[PDB]
Amino acid sequence: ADLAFEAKSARDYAWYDVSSFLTYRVLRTGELEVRVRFSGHDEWVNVKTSVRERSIPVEPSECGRVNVGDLLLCFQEREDQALYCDGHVLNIKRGIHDHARCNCVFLVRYELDNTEESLGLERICRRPE
Ligand SMILES: OC[C@H]1O[C@H](O[C@H]2[C@H](O)[C@@H](O)[C@H](OCCCCC3CCCCC3)O[C@@H]2CO)[C@H](O)[C@@H](O)[C@@H]1O
Numbered sequence: 001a002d003l004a005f006e007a008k009s010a011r012d013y014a015w016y017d018v019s020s021f022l023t024y025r026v027l028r029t030g031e032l033e034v035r036v037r038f039s040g041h042d043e044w045v046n047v048k049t050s051v052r053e054r055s056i057p058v059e060p061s062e063c064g065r066v067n068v069g070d071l072l073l074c075f076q077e078r079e080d081q082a083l084y085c086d087g088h089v090l091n092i093k094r095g096i097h098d099h100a101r102c103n104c105v106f107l108v109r110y111e112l113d114n115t116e117e118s119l120g121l122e123r124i125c126r127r128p129e
């Protein structure tokens with residue numbers, strides 16, 4: 001299977017699945033940027049910093065491969081809005097569960113503002129590798 005990607009947006013700092021790439025441009029400065037179309041509107045995003053390989057769901061049977069200090073894309077639901085953004089695992093309370101669903105609790109620290117939330121596996125994706 002081929003590489004899929006996600007891009008970070010300058011509007012909200014959240015990551016969105018990239019559908020396709022349209023063109024590119026070089027800045028006076030030398031930074032390279034890329035015009036990205038999102039799946040589901042259109043943006044210039046820095047290649048080095050704001051585009052990476054798509055995060056990957058964790059299945060309950062493999063919840064053990066998530067550790068502290070791991071970087072994860074987290075579904076951060078609030079008021080109304082819901083953003084997928086980066087946080088790091090600070091701590092894990094492992095639960096008693098089978099392959100069907102994971103009741104482990106992952107305390108994450110969101111990178112942007114250092115706020116803290118407790119998430120289920122269902123609201124986190126790991127990074128490749
Ligand atoms: O590249 C900058 C940093 O992040 C990397 O991940 C990112 C990396 O940033 C970025 O350059 C690289 O961009 C690849 C973006 C894909 C460009 C687009 C692809 C479809 C059509 C061709 C053009 O993606 C890496 C993942 O392949 C690496 O994880 C990191 O080591 C590296 O320093």
Ligand SMILES: [Zn+2]
Nearest residue numbers: 063102103104
């Ligand atoms: Zn688990």
